[PDB]
Amino acid sequence: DSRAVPTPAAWELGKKSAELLITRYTQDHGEWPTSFGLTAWGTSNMRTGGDDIAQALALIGVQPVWDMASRRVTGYEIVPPAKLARPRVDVTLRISGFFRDAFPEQIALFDKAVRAVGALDEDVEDNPIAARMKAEQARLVAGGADPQTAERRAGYRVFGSKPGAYGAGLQALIDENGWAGRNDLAEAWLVWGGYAYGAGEEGQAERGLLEERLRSVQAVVQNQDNREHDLLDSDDYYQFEGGMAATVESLTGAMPSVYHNDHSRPEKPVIRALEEELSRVVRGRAANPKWIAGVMRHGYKGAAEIAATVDYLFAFAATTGKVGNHHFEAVYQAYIADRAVHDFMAEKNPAALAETAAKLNEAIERGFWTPRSNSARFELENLS
Numbered sequence: 079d080s081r082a083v084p085t086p087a088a089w090e091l092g093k094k095s096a097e098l099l100i101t102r103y104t105q106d107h108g109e110w111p112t113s114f115g116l117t118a119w120g121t122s123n124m125r126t127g128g129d130d131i132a133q134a135l136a137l138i139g140v141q142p143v144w145d146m147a148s149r150r151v152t153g154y155e156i157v158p159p160a161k162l163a164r165p166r167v168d169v170t171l172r173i174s175g176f177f178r179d180a181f182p183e184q185i186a187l188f189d190k191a192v193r194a195v196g197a198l199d200e201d202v203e204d205n206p207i208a209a210r211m212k213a214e215q216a217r218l219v220a221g222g223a224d225p226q227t228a229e230r231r232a233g234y235r236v237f238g239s240k241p242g243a244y245g246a247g248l249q250a251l252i253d254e255n256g257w258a259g260r261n262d263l264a265e266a267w268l269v270w271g272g273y274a275y276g277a278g279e280e281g282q283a284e285r286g287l288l289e290e291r292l293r294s295v296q297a298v299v300q301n302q303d304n305r306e307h308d309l310l311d312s313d314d315y316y317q318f319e320g321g322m323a324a325t326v327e328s329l330t331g332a333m334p335s336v337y338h339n340d341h342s343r344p345e346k347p348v349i350r351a352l353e354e355e356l357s358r359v360v361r362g363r364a365a366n367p368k369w370i371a372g373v374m375r376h377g378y379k380g381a382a383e384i385a386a387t388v389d390y391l392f393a394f395a396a397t398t399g400k401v402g403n404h405h406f407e408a409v410y411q412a413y414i415a416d417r418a419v420h421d422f423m424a425e426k427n428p429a430a431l432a433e434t435a436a437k438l439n440e441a442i443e444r445g446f447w448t449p450r451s452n453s454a455r456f457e458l459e460n461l462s
């Protein structure tokens with residue numbers, strides 16, 4: 079039932095997640111955060127009863143109100159600063175197409191709650207949201223806007239692909255490998271996802287506002303609720319979170335922090351930097367000999383999984399630069415320079431092996447991977 083989202087359980091999860099995330103930000107940077115960017119998918123919030131909406135609401139310092147008997151959400155309440163041991167944090171929400179289609183009432187609740195917070199009389203130190211909204215509202219009025227329209231424009235925090243469309247709109251570009259820099263991905267990303275959603279707003283084109291929001295962002299955030307997929311067995315994670323982060327860098331010239339958080343255990347959510355999660359997946363899956371044993375008893379599908387992994391590794395390197403040499407080395411050593419695994423791929427899927435050795439040579443060229451010795455570089459183009 080959509081009417082009951084976010085749930086009490088999802089709000090506990092998202093309230094705890096938000097605090098661990100601010101703690102972690104303060105530990106990495108030595109100051110309070112003022113602006114996060116969040117990604118929000120449909121099936122994820124169905125499975126958790128609205129973890130991401132919850133989190134975004136706790137970050138801005140607002141809480142759902144439920145009917146005590148039916149447990150439908152009937153509205154929101156502002157957490158007052160009396161109840162806040164940390165500052166409100168500004169949130170910009172990149173929503174997927176399916177999330178747009180499945181959770182419009184929750185988009186409407188988020189949109190309202192954030193405009194409400196944006197209209198309080200709090201100090202800048204405590205409320206960056208209000209300070210941004212009023213200042214940008216001022217600026218649009220200076221240049222000659224109707225105050226009503228300034229309010230609307232300065233107050234959008236929800237952004238996605240246009241009505242009837244889906245995805246991150248990078249797939250054309252990235253697969254063909256026709257980009258000069260991050261700027262090309264960021265351009266395409268902004269184009270596709272630059273549509274605003276509000277209480278009574280149905281997907282206006284506002285690419286300018288999205289740029290203004292992404293310039294403020296200090297950290298990109300994504301929550302994963304299950305251990306069934308991982309950020310390296312699908313293209314979706316790098317497109318959404320890697321895309322956003324690439325865009326902030328194109329706009330600001332500095333790569334924001336990225337945090338890829340674990341909500342698979344709702345009682346204990348773990349915050350991790352993207353670098354840390356990539357590492358966990360390489361140790362626990364990609365380069366895990368038990369996992370590699372497994373996919374060598376699946377022939378074609380199995381060697382596809384291998385090639386795919388290096389693809390998404392490659393794609394994270396290009397969007398965020400948060401893949402190290404160690405990682406590329408690990409997949410080369412475990413996939414190509416293990417003749418057991420090489421031979422398995424040559425036999426059972428010669429395409430996947432050429433794809434693989436192509437993406438590894440592109441990694442050397444583009445500077446993602448400086449190999450252990452030049453022996454490596456010869457063999458890889460050789461094999462292609």
Ligand SMILES: C/C1=C2N=C(/C=C3\N/C(=C(/C)C4=N[C@@](C)([C@@H]5N=C1[C@](C)(CCC(=O)O)[C@H]5CC(=O)O)[C@@](C)(CC(N)=O)[C@@H]4CCC(=O)O)[C@@](C)(CC(N)=O)[C@@H]3CCC(=O)O)C(C)(C)[C@@H]/2CCC(=O)O
Nearest residue numbers: 118119120121122174175176177243244245246307312314
């Ligand atoms: C994370 C996302 C996901 N979509 C996937 C793959 C699939 N979706 C598919 C498709 C093809 C689609 N995947 C969608 C649902 C996209 N998949 C997503 C997105 C990014 C988000 C989905 C969400 O909001 O949960 C979808 C795009 C969007 O909604 O804007 C989709 C709308 C993409 C598009 N048309 O451009 C489109 C559905 C179209 C339709 O039918 O009418 C497949 C059926 C085929 C494929 N390999 O592309 C596949 C099924 C799972 C598997 O093979 O293991 C997952 C599961 C890896 C992944 C995670 C979701 C989760 O966390 O549970």
